[PDB]
């Protein structure tokens, strides 16, 4: 329900070091940080955010008593994020001249949580550190640091200038090209994360650039989705208690644009008045008292013992109709705007086993279940598929709605294979065969017998929001200036690796010549 | 508006069932027509339909031609029209037809072709398509009158020139139905098989009752320049329950709805430039011109930008986001496309790879990465095209569309259980086909709506096919149920009522040596193993305690 997040940002001198063409660590961190705060603000989440800074020229923090935890500043204490925080990140806050002890910052960051959460109720306390691990630090605190993080249940994440031509946010620095100090800091970071989450913990160390094309900064604070309880039934004598979760559901712009007066900028003054009148000439006006409804039925017009003739459903359900070869239920038929994952009711070992049987039973015979789905009593029944999905950590059925006959639009199309008019030449075929090879967005790399996606579009966030948020913000801070251009790192993440573009050139050229194309 | 004339052969053969528990070709024909009528009404389509029989005894056509009866002229589908056609369904309806327009009569297709060609002219609207669908189980109508047979071929040839197209819904006849004896030089342009069952006839009719309608046409740019035009089609589209319309209570007439916004204080009607856009976040108001609300969505210009090719394996079935579209070449805009497109479809199929593109429908809309999955053509036994050739445009979700899920512990079933479930799965096997179920609600709605438009006593409560045939499933399952429960449900079940791991990892990752000595002690204290005062000691120990 609520999360307390501390953004511990390195602002030290080396953060400003700028290599020709490449944004400096400070500028990248500033970008990632703003991406986080923007989201929290325009989304209206009530997660509280504190911002710590280490490397500031001065010292402003609760633990500074005695020339300690120096150059660490708690720029912002725990509290909802507002535009005043955003404006502080762009303008106000700038790069420092000093180099604070990175673990000291962490401790100060931990202290903000600990003390400032007492009177409140948070479900998750999380800390995000952005730094280049460029300077010295005392390992002496590690002891207390770890143990406290564990006892207090504060989770952690690190964002660095590298990973474990440069395009910010693209899909393209040797651990040899980093300083030795950086290497030493990284070992302590790597350790700390291993002690907190083990192996997987290493996946909590990101690079600023990859963070722009991921939602990883929001990972530890996403609001779990509630389950749907129901009985998967086979016949009227077999019953299995299940729980369904929206696995896939398109995220949409939530807030809407309110129409206001160009000057008062108020809504009250504005009012839409929808009136009715005779459609054909002699356009007389009509009165509500004198207006009925009714539906069309071809040329017929029926004024619609009436509503009382609406479909009557037995209500909520998830009953099996039958099973069948998976191959017969083709993906091109999938419909609806969601994907449900069905599991056995929580803490019901019996059901767990019951469902497991079914799941494996389907994966084996290579079949699937055609089922009737009904969310609640008022819901319109559905017919869809439930197919097995087995993994390392769990097992379940993926439900996806199928079509009703009236949804089918069957148009015939001319075979292009048997077309003597269009059949491509051998010169043309190999030409394309060449292109496809060059534009491969995958590679049988590393674990030799393994395939690696080079362009995981489903790991990229919808460029829709960051765009919108950017604009919204730019208007809040710069009311007079016109909306800004899309940010490069957003364009860079929506484009494929540079390799692909390169390898494609020549092939494409040949394909240009070999395939004539002229507009009618 | 598209026009469609349904031409039905009323010869005596058409009323003889081919010795099966199947219907007579006439009956099939009639019923497939009531279907197309009802189909059009459901999708609220504005197409024009007509009904014409030939080879009848009586006649009714503009120029009193003989043996030709025009039951219904080109017009929109209505309750009464369907009711009328329905009066000729079934055996009893066959008599009704026989009596009214006695079958088995002389005739000549030219005269018939003319009447239909004529029903079009009479139309007072503009028509996007002019087709005639001929239902006949007679393959060589004028094989004995080498003159009529000639007028008919000519007359047909003329219709094509006028833009009128005829499709042959040939029905079964003893011995088969040779298309090459006549209709060969008559139909417009392998061909469909002869229909002997109402099931295949409808499938054949449905496959031609409508004409290709693209959702749009876009530039599928392989790069800035190399571009081909394609048509985007939506083969699947949730059929909605049309909303009611408002009527002038006295004349039950449609009523347009104007919408006028205005300033309340000055009573003045507002123009688009007298209002700006707003959104508030806390104590912060943000104002943008309407032009800007749209400006901030603009990325690519409309089209399909190629991003590369990815092995179909990486595309996941459970990664569904929204219905898929169909991509076919649009030779009309950019000539040569059908070729480039065809090559791609051929190579993507060979390489089992889909083409990844940044899709943008209309202007000002965020892009979406989609997968153009290669799709091979497929025809069934009746030569009906089940799956067209081209590309399945598949939407891929953005990170925001994925909702991750926490898990409890995995509790797997035993091979004996999977066994019993497998058995159950097979007893309930069946062949799924996309046209299997009708929408319960839509049916109910329109069925009632019909009954009412026909001042009928009451409506026809449809039969929900989407419901599970319980008694059946039960019977077919036998003891398997009770035998399955035994394997999984305890007899008293409420069916309806520095841990070793960590440290072992630090060693593998070489981070143990980065431990402070206090951390090292506590660790050795926990395994109460013989330690030291030095770090290397504690280090050697702990490592040895695990690995050595």
Curated annotation (Swiss-Prot), chain A:
Assembly behavior: Heterodimer composed of XRCC5/Ku80 and XRCC6/Ku70; heterodimerization stabilizes XRCC5 protein. Component of the core long-range non-homologous end joining (NHEJ) complex (also named DNA-PK complex) composed of PRKDC, LIG4, XRCC4, XRCC6/Ku70, XRCC5/Ku86 and NHEJ1/XLF. Additional component of the NHEJ complex includes PAXX. Following autophosphorylation, PRKDC dissociates from DNA, leading to formation of the short-range NHEJ complex, composed of LIG4, XRCC4, XRCC6/Ku70, XRCC5/Ku86 and NHEJ1/XLF. (Microbial infection) Interacts with human T-cell leukemia virus 1/HTLV-1 protein HBZ.
Whole-protein residues included: 6 to 542 of 732
Localization (cell): Nucleus; Nucleus, Nucleolus; Chromosome
Region (Leucine-zipper): 133-160
Function: Single-stranded DNA-dependent ATP-dependent helicase that plays a key role in DNA non-homologous end joining (NHEJ) by recruiting DNA-PK to DNA. Required for double-strand break repair and V(D)J recombination. Also has a role in chromosome translocation. The DNA helicase II complex binds preferentially to fork-like ends of double-stranded DNA in a cell cycle-dependent manner. It works in the 3'-5' direction. During NHEJ, the XRCC5-XRRC6 dimer performs the recognition step: it recognizes and binds to the broken ends of the DNA and protects them from further resection.
Residue numbers bearing the Phosphothreonine modification: 513
PTM characteristics: ADP-ribosylated by PARP3.
Phosphoserine carried by residues: 236, 239, 299
Chain positions with N6-acetyllysine modification: 139, 246, 310
Induction (free text): In osteoblasts, by FGF2.
Protein family (similarity comment): Belongs to the ku80 family.
More info: Individuals with systemic lupus erythematosus (SLE) and related disorders produce extremely large amounts of autoantibodies to XRCC6 and XRCC5.
Superkingdom as given in the UniProt entry: Eukaryota
GO function term, MF aspect, one: DNA binding
A GO term from the CC aspect: nucleus
Cross-link Glycyl lysine isopeptide (Lys-Gly) (interchain with G-Cter in SUMO2), sequence positions: 176, 510, 512
Organism this protein belongs to: Homo sapiens (Human)
Ku domain ranges (all copies): 234-430
Keywords of this entry: Acetylation, Activator, ADP-ribosylation, ATP-binding, Chromosome, DNA damage, DNA recombination, DNA repair, DNA-binding, Helicase, Host-virus interaction, Hydrolase, Immunity, Innate immunity, Isopeptide bond, Nucleotide-binding, Nucleus, Phosphoprotein, Ribosome biogenesis, Systemic lupus erythematosus, Transcription, Transcription regulation, Ubl conjugation
Record comment regarding domains: The EEXXXDDL motif is required for the interaction with catalytic subunit PRKDC and its recruitment to sites of DNA damage.
Name under which the protein is recorded: X-ray repair cross-complementing protein 5
Gene Ontology biological process: activation of innate immune response; cellular response to gamma radiation; cellular response to leukemia inhibitory factor; DNA damage response; DNA recombination; double-strand break repair; double-strand break repair via nonhomologous end joining; hematopoietic stem cell differentiation
Residues in VWFA domain copies: 4-212
E.C. code: 3.6.4.-
Enzyme kind, highest EC tier: hydrolase
From Swiss-Prot, chain B:
Residues carrying N6,N6,N6-trimethyllysine: 509
Post-translational modification Phosphothreonine, affected residues: 414
DNA-binding: annotated segments: 236-300
Modification(s) after translation: Phosphorylation by PRKDC may enhance helicase activity. Phosphorylation of Ser-17 does not affect DNA repair. ADP-ribosylated by PARP3.
Keyword Cytoplasm: yes
Record keywords: Acetylation, Activator, ADP-ribosylation, ATP-binding, Chromosome, Cytoplasm, DNA damage, DNA recombination, DNA repair, DNA-binding, Helicase, Host-virus interaction, Hydrolase, Immunity, Innate immunity, Isopeptide bond, Lyase, Methylation, Multifunctional enzyme, Nucleotide-binding, Nucleus, Phosphoprotein, Systemic lupus erythematosus, Transcription, Transcription regulation, Ubl conjugation
Main localisation: nucleus
Protein name as it appears in the record: X-ray repair cross-complementing protein 6
SMART domains the record matches: Ku78, SAP
Gene: XRCC6
Domain Ku: 220-427
Keyword Cytoplasm attributed: yes
Role noted for this protein: Single-stranded DNA-dependent ATP-dependent helicase that plays a key role in DNA non-homologous end joining (NHEJ) by recruiting DNA-PK to DNA. Required for double-strand break repair and V(D)J recombination. Also has a role in chromosome translocation. Has a role in chromosome translocation. The DNA helicase II complex binds preferentially to fork-like ends of double-stranded DNA in a cell cycle-dependent manner. It works in the 3'-5' direction.
EC number(s) per entry: 3.6.4.-, 4.2.99.-
Region (Interaction with BAX): 517-522
Entries under Pfam families matching the protein: Ku, Ku_C, Ku_N, SAP
